[PDB]
Design a protein around this ligand. Structure first.
Ligand SMILES: [Mg+2]
Ligand SMILES: [Zn+2]
Ligand SMILES: [Zn+2]
Ligand SMILES: [Zn+2]
Ligand SMILES: [Zn+2]
Lengths: 117, 44, 64, 477, 49, 257, 39, 528, 34
């Protein structure tokens, strides 16, 4: 056995923690989040939302190695805003978008219980 | 233990230190019978 | 040796279409029309049946 | 024509090749006699009266495609490749896994490989119906894309779909047999199959002997791992000094079947076959039908491969840089011809010197099914969903799985067993010995100037020793 | 199997149709072992009586 | 600095595919839900086989593999089943499993097909998709087969036997109004199915201040879930991933002091 | 193990006389019997 | 006999004194990995859990080592021996209770090989000192050795079933000398020809050429995504080149962040028209040539093999001469990662649309071939009436052969030029030939226009039969098609008689390589 | 009675006849019987 089992790609171990914060010391108001056991499905959904905020200067993500399961996100905001603020405000805007789209979908499938035509 | 002939497939218990021949067929190639302890697989 | 149960690329279930495929080629159908009467429209799912060699029917000739 | 319409009826007419020679229409021509002859290569084109090359033709060829051997007549469009390429594949289709004989259940061969799901080509040469390549094929038609994706397929490598491997793609099995023969080498030294017990026998290791039965052999069905004993054979001492046979390391097989019988000189002997399944991983070697070998670089899931506008992800991705230097343009036509054969329902024809199948005749056939007339397609990126600015050339091709797998070539040594006379590192039954530190390696280190590393590798790593020497004289003490 | 003389290794004009021109191994045995073509037939012998 | 108001519009609806259109959203969101139809929708499938007597032509690990790829009806009772690694029971229990059973013996001289009509379960909610028949193996006079299997719950990142969908089409911008892709000769390319161009045009005129909208989907199904509950279970599954990550985050910047 | 360790600087060859051959040998008197073991 | 016991090779003087078999070594296949630094190597977990490294116990590392010795041979990062001061080598596999084992200053634990270690890595034949360099360990899941691509040029490797060995220094002195003498970033320039040995390679070169064209504009999201992959980025986003209609960055503007320090260089691109330095536009260059790197930023020019590969005066050579050996490493790694993550947006391929020409070019090729086959006939028929005059030092035959070669060689060139001047900017052959990644300008003409003229032993196809080449011709035929001139292209296919002559040429070209290896190896061994 | 343009089908009929009778290993089987 020199091949990892398939559940290592999404299942967290005992000592690990899913998210970790570190402050970048090269520029002010920068932060660097490190989500664990994750991939492009969640990494990309966040970055596109941060750019829609008019108070965010930088936003990006990378999977440092495709054979390990970990992503990294970097954010930088204006001096009157917090990276931890901009991050959590992004998530609550995705959830407010998905739950809305689910209602509009469940209506569309029962819009033709018998059929419109 | 129990052996299976190579031609007529008639099981016959061969005792330790005994010639290797079938019965009702007179044949000299024997296959050992499959075990009875169970092993489990994955569909993966 | 035996028809796979799933197309390798799509994932569509193929393993239940081998006897119906032989039955359509039996009467008069061309391979191009028999594959359309079964609902295989991507060229990755048609390769499955078009290029299959059935070796299981020749290993049933040896007495157990 | 009278000879043809009665030759297509050999089944119930008893008219065959022999009645064709005995009627004076064909003739065997030696090599010496072949210097006094004038050949035409094709009737309808070289035997027409005109301002002509010659006018005294004495013979004519049947088909100029019969100048190729057996392993070189399975290549589609071989008259489009560079010459050294056709030599490599003919020496490479001899080591591709497939099904090698129909009664592979009876034969207890050593080292037999068998593929799960073989398939016959979608682009065939007409001289493959006579060597039975559609009844015992070796390969699978895969959907190949020629693109640079993430850098893991550079310098002769391939990226392959991981969730196609999970549906049976290129899966195979691997058998292996072992012999043991009980023997009476002396009048007292005699061997016998029996289960060695710890207190009576003496020379055993501490390994487990519970899997063995009363006979001394393992019943089929158990899961024998590395370093297990399979055959218990004890020798009587002038008490009982046992031998045995152990596996190699890293097998993880399952005992298939056990046979017991009498060999030629009448000594009882047995044969044991071990079964093991091999799933493709990222060291294995894959090769096309045109001399493009290459290992596997990485495996992506289906949610990550690039897709087309209807959800067709490729199974294999190869580097575009492999084509322009070696000029295998026969590889670029069988994936264009193959895409027409899957959409129309026929099976293509790639006989070498056909002169009835251009590229303009294949391309015009493809634009009828609603595709671009050169194979290109618009692929979407799998990570971000964006379109790719270039259009990628994609289509089905026929790949083979070579015999060199990576489970068989990895080995390591770290303070292992050593010899007895010269005390140099030894491998023996260990399977993993050391790598030789040759003469040319002794010189790169001298040029480097590394004097410590050169000493360690030759003295401290291999047979260190100490002696005592006298001072006035120079002799050992 | 190691002689450097090329004339017993190169491809000769008279191999047309009787020995395969493309199939040969690399290494030290280049052109020393060869495979015969598809319709090539070797004679068996008879008596000149 | 806030979300959008996407609008859905269904075009077709059968028992094996759905065609719909999602307007007024971003490309990253329209793709992140294309990867969830494939990977992260849970489903039932066989994952534990034990063979008692196999005298057929295929070896034991061949049949144990052709069984896992058989699709089982996972319509309603996937939400009541725990993951076998979370459940507080032993290796197996009727709260996180479903037990199957096969036992076939060939006695007549004519060959016998061992279809999927032989998989006999105990729970009448999960059966193979039969309401033709997938072939498992053929037997000769004097051969037999009998085994026992359990069927767990998982999704498509474990193994490709747990994904519920065949090909999932997806595309946007049917005419290069954005020039995301660049044709060398735009005349040789067939016109898309969703295009609105004339019969004598190739591309729409370029507009620089554009943005991708109105994505087109087409989701087929293998037979386990209905094609409209593959979508509802995906959006309800992606929402529950972000909602759980927001917990871990606020738990971190709260324990910062 | 109680005596010091040191390098080598020069190797001198030469034939050795029967004198030291007899003086430093281990089986005094000499090996006489062509048979190695007896019981 | 005794003198027979110490024979030559495989005796006791030439087989076990200087060349022997060592321990602490492994061997397996190699596969690419673009995510590794040029000084790292990837090791599977089954090899790393087998080879060890003896670590002396000091009060600085007592706790970590006793923690490691708690878990032995079962967990991976463990240990498998304890060597105390007395020389007692106890085995952790058999000890009944591990907790009683208390490490003490002076003891010596036998650790498992972990990340960060140093190894020595060589390939099958070792020719120059670059065939054995010191890498650094990084442990990955599956079971092949993984290494970067720009290092495949020194080892002369390729990933089609190759194998390489590694040896693990056991002491600490040997570890220090391998570290300060033979690590791979210390061997970039070679003393053999005072030029670098590692340059940008097969796939990154083609993309670097396209990334630095005059018209490559990037949006905001893509620029951020690319900057995410720079390991030496200070944290500032440069001002775009176009600010108004909307902000767009350029390829050269992003590449200027990869270039280290403040270096200076002037090169040319491989398509620089030689008549450009003459007229005006010497410092304007309509074709965007004459690379100029001023104060560490790309001002103008396209990058290719003449400016990034392994030649004297390249960009990597200057960066090594000025900045040092520890910054060129980052240069290589950053180039590779950034360009790959842009290439998966731009894409690259090769098809048969890139191997075909328009209707006008085919007619021109047919015409020139017809006229050449005409001229050869006039030469032949004027040599049959004894109207040729030999030149000084030339037989009548050899003068004829020399002229027939000149007519035929010019057609291969003139047809070849026709195949090129009809190519397009979107062609994918021209894209690998121009950037210098793979191919040559004659393969284009051989694929599109004419294969050319075959020849064995450096001369035209000989008369293997008596006064013939094959039994399909008439005797003493000296025409072009009857003695090896293949006038088709690889796309139009060859006729049987041309297939055979092509096979002959290939066969001789295949034998020479088989001889060369043994010859050169033996002579080098003698000289050394 | 001449074969024109039906040559491609006809030549394969004659090649098939040779392989049906001689086979691929008649090389070995005929020198042994001798
Ligand atoms: Mg190689
Ligand atoms: Zn019997
Ligand atoms: Zn499919
Ligand atoms: Zn002395
Ligand atoms: Zn349970």
């Amino acid at each position: 056995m020199n091949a990892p089992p398939a559940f290592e790609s999404f299942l967290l171990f005992e000592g690990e923690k899913k998210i970790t914060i570190n402050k970048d010391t090269k520029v002010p108001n920068a932060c660097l989040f490190t989500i664990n056991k994750e991939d492009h499905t969640l990494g990309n959904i966040i970055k596109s939302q941060l750019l829609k905020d008019p108070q965010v200067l930088f936003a990006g993500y990378k999977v440092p190695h495709p054979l390990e399961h970990k992503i990294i996100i970097r954010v930088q905001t204006t001096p009157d805003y917090s990276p931890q603020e901009a991050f959590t405000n992004a998530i609550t805007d995705l959830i407010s978008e998905l739950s809305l789209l689910e209602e509009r979908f469940r209506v569309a499938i029962k819009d033709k219980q018998e059929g419109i035509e | 233990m129990i052996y299976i002939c190579g031609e007529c497939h008639t099981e016959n218990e061969i005792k330790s230190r005994d010639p290797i021949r079938c019965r009702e067929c007179g044949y000299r190639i024997m296959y050992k019978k499959r075990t009875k302890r169970l092993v489990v697989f994955d569909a993966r | 040796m035996i028809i796979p149960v799933r197309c390798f690329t799509c994932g569509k279930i193929v393993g239940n279409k081998w006897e119906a495929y032989l039955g359509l080629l039996q009467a008069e159908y061309t391979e191009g029309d028999a594959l359309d009467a079964l609902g295989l429209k991507r060229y990755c799912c048609r390769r499955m049946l078009l290029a299959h060699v059935d070796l299981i029917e020749k290993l049933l000739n040896y007495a157990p | 024509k009278r000879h043809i319409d009665q030759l297509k009826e050999r089944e119930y007419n008893n008219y065959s090749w022999q009645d064709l020679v005995a009627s004076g229409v064909v003739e065997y021509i030696d090599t010496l006699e072949e210097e006094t002859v004038m050949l035409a290569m094709t009737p309808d084109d070289l035997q027409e009266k005109e301002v002509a090359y010659c006018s005294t033709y004495t013979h004519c060829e049947i088909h100029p495609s019969m100048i190729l051997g057996v392993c070189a007549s399975i290549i589609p469009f071989p008259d489009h490749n560079q010459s050294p390429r056709n030599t490599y594949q003919s020496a490479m289709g001899k080591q591709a896994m497939g099904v090698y004989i129909t009664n592979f259940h009876v034969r207890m061969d050593t080292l037999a490989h068998v593929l799960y799901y073989p398939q016959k080509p979608l682009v065939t040469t007409r001289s493959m119906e006579y060597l039975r390549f559609r009844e015992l094929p070796a390969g699978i038609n895969s959907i190949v894309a020629i693109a640079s994706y993430t850098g893991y397929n550079q310098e002769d490598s391939v990226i392959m779909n991981r969730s196609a491997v999970d549906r049976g793609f290129f899966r195979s099995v691997f058998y292996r047999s072992y012999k043991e023969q009980e023997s009476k080498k002396g009048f007292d030294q005699e061997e016998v199959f029996e289960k060695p017990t710890r207190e009576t026998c003496q020379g055993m290791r501490h390994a487990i002997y519970d899997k063995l039965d009363d006979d001394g052999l393992i019943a089929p069905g158990v899961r024998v791992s590395g370093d297990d004993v399979i055959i218990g054979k004890t020798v009587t001492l002038p008490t009982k000094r046992d031998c045995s046979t152990f596996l190699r390391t890293s097998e993880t097989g399952i005992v298939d079947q056990v046979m017991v019988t009498l060999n030629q000189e009448g000594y009882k002997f047995c044969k044991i076959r071990v079964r093991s399944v091999r799933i493709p991983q990222i060291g294995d070697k894959f090769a096309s039908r045109h001399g493009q070998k290459g290992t596997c670089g990485i495996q992506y899931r289906q949610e990550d491969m690039p897709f087309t506008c209807e959800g067709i992800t490729p199974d294999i991705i190869i580097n575009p840089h492999a084509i322009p230097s070696r000029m295998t343009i026969g590889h670029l036509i069988e994936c264009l011809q193959g895409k027409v054969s899957a959409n129309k329902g026929e099976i293509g024809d790639a006989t070498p010197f056909n002169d009835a199948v251009n590229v303009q005749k294949i391309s015009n056939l493809l634009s009828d099914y609603g595709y671009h007339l050169r194979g290109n397609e618009v692929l979407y990126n799998g990570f971000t969903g964006r379109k790719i600015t270039s259009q990628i050339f994609i289509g089905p091709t026929y790949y083979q799985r070579l015999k060199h797998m990576v489970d068989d070539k990895i080995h390591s040594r770290a303070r292992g067993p050593i010899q007895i006379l010269n005390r140099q590192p030894m491998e023996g039954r260990s399977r993993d010995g050391g790598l030789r530190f040759g003469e040319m390696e002794r010189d790169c280190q001298i040029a480097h100037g590394a004097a410590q590393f050169l000493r360690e590798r030759l003295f401290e790593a291999s047979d260190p020793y100490q002696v005592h020497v006298c001072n006035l004289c120079g002799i050992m003490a | 199997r190691d002689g450097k003389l090329a004339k017993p290794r190169q491809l000769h004009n008279t191999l047309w149709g009787m020995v395969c021109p493309a199939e040969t191994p690399e290494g030290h045995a280049v052109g020393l072992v060869k495979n015969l073509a598809l319709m090539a037939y070797i004679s068996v012998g008879s008596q000149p009586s | 600095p806030y979300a959008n108001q996407p609008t859905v519009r269904i075009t077709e609806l059968t028992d094996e595919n759905v065609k719909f259109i999602i307007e007024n959203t971003d490309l990253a969101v329209a793709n992140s839900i294309r990867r969830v139809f494939i990977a992260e929708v849970p489903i039932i499938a066989i994952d534990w086989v034990q063979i008692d007597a196999n005298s057929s032509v295929l070896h034991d690990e061949f049949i144990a593999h052709r069984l896992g790829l058989i699709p089982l009806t996972s319509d309603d009772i996937v939400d009541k089943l725990q993951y076998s690694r979370d459940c507080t029971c032993e290796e197996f229990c009727p709260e996180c499993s479903v037990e199957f059973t096969l036992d076939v013996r060939c006695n007549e001289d004519q060959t016998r097909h061992v279809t999927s009509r032989d998989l006999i379960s105990n729970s009448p909610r999960v059966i193979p998709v039969t309401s033709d028949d997938i072939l498992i193996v053929k037997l000769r006079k004097g051969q037999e087969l009998r085994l026992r299997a359990y069927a767990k719950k998982g999704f498509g990142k474990e193994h490709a036997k747990w994904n519920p969908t065949a090909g999932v089409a997806f595309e946007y911008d049917p005419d290069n109004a954005l020039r995301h892709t660049v044709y060398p000769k735009p005349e040789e390319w067939p016109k898309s199915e969703y295009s609105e161009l004339d019969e004598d045009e190739s591309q729409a005129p370029y507009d620089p201040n554009g943005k991708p909208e109105r994505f087109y989907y087409n989701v087929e199904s293998c037979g386990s879930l209905r094609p409209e509950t593959i979508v509802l279970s995906a959006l309800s599954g992606l929402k529950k991933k972000l909602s759980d990550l927001q917990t871990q985050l606020s738990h971190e910047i709260q324990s910062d002091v | 193990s109680a005596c010091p360790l040191r390098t080598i600087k020069r190797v001198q060859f030469g034939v050795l006389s029967p004198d030291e051959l007899k003086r430093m040998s281990v089986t005094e008197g000499g090996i006489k019997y062509p048979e190695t073991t007896e019981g | 006999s005794l003198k027979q016991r110490l024979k030559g090779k495989e005796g006791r003087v030439r087989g076990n004194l200087m060349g022997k078999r060592v321990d602490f070594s492994a061997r397996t296949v190699i596969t690419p990995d673009p995510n590794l630094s040029i000084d790292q190597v990837g090791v599977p977990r089954s090899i790393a859990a087998n080879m060890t490294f003896a670590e002396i116990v000091t009060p600085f590392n007592i706790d970590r080592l006793q923690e490691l010795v708690r878990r032995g041979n079962s967990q991976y990062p463990g240990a498998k021996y304890i060597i105390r001061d007395n020389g007692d080598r106890i085995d952790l596999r058999f000890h009944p209770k591990p907790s009683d084992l208390h490490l003490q200053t002076g003891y010596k634990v036998e650790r498992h090989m972990c990340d960060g270690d140093i190894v020595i890595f060589n390939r099958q034949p070792t020719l120059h000192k670059m065939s054995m360099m010191g890498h650094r360990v990084r442990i990955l899941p599956w079971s092949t050795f993984r290494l970067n691509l720009s290092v495949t040029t020194p080892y002369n490797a390729d990933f089609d079933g190759d194998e390489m060995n590694l040896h693990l220094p056991q002491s600490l002195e040997t570890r220090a000398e391998i570290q300060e003498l033979a690590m791979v970033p210390r061997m970039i320039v070679t003393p053999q020809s005072n030029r670098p040995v590692m340059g940008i390679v097969q796939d990154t070169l083609t993309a670097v050429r396209k990334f630095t064209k005059r018209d490559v504009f990037l949006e905001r999201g893509e620029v951020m995504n690319l900057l995410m992959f720079l390991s030496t980025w200070d944290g500032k986003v440069p001002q775009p080149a176009i600010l108004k209609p909307r902000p767009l960055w350029t390829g050269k503007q992003i590449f200027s962040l990869i270039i280290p320090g403040h270096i200076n260089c002037i090169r040319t691109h491989s398509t620089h028209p030689d008549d450009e330095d003459s007229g005006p536009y010497k410092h304007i260059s309509p074709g965007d040539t004459k690379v100029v790197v001023e104060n560490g930023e790309l001002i103008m020019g396209i990058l290719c093999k003449k400016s990034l590969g392994t030649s004297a005066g390249s960009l990597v050579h200057i960066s090594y001469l000025e900045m040092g050996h520890d910054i060129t490493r980052l240069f290589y790694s950053n180039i590779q990662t950034v360009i790959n993550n842009w290439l998966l947006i731009e894409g690259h391929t090769i098809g048969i649309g890139d191997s075909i020409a328009d209707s006008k070019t085919y007619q021109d090729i047919q015409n020139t071939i017809k006229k050449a086959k005409q001229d050869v006939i006039e030469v032949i028929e004027k040599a049959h009436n004894n109207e040729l005059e030999p030149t000084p030092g030339n037989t009548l035959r050899q003068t004829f052969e020399n002229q027939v070669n000149r007519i035929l060689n010019d057609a291969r060139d003139k047809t070849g030029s026709s195949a090129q001047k009809s190519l397009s900017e979107y062609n994918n052959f021209k894209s690998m030939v121009v950037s210098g990644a793979k191919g040559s300008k004659i393969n284009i003409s051989q694929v599109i226009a004419v294969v050319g003229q075959q020849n064995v032993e450096g001369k035209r196809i000989p008369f293997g039969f008596k006064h013939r080449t094959l039994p399909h011709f008439i005797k003493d035929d000296y025409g072009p098609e009857s003695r090896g001139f293949v006038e088709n292209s690889y796309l139009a296919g060859l006729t049987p008689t041309e297939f055979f002559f092509h096979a002959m040429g290939g066969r001789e070209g295949l034998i020479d390589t088989a001889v060369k290896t043994a010859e050169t190896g033996y002579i080098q061994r003698r000289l050394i | 009675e001449i074969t024109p343009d039906l040559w491609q089908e006809a030549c394969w009929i004659v090649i098939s006849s040779y392989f049906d009778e001689k086979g691929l290993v008649r090389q070995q089987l005929d020198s042994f019987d001798e």
